[PDB]
Design a protein around this ligand. Sequence first.
Ligand SMILES: CNC(=O)c1n[nH]c2ccc(I)cc12
Length: 164
Amino acid sequence: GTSKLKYVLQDARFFLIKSNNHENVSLAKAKGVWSTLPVNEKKLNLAFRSARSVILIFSVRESGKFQGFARLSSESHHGGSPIHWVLPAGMSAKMLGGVFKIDWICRRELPFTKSAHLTNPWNEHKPVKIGRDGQEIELECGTQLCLLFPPDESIDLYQVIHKM
Ligand SMILES: CNC(=O)c1n[nH]c2ccc(I)cc12
């Protein structure tokens, strides 16, 4: 069913995450973590205090798809176990901020062809697939986008609901 999912998304905030490569999304799915640039880290930390749920919707650049979505379970923190993120070219991971803990809500993919009817008011009503890393997605568009994903029957949202 979709009822617990709708409860988790009620009055949520949504952010588009653009990963440079599939390796980083695979690490995030395995370890329940994400890290971003300080400009976006500050936005996500503000949002985490401001909303019942903050949802990250992931898309690997040039893949033509979203790879799933997850809910922040913490503000960013430093000093944890290192994560061997992959960065394009020889760019240094030192530019990243802290680490957010996340709980995956859906690990299934969704092709951009299926979200063509959704526009994001916070990005000039462009199709929701279009946006820089960290672009906020307005509530209604973000909710409908998450509801388009195939159900992920491996996930039990009972534990997530307890964290709200
Ligand atoms: C695991 N997160 C990243 O690798 C990442 N997040 N935002 C970015 C902006 C520029 C570059 I180069 C890399 C990133």
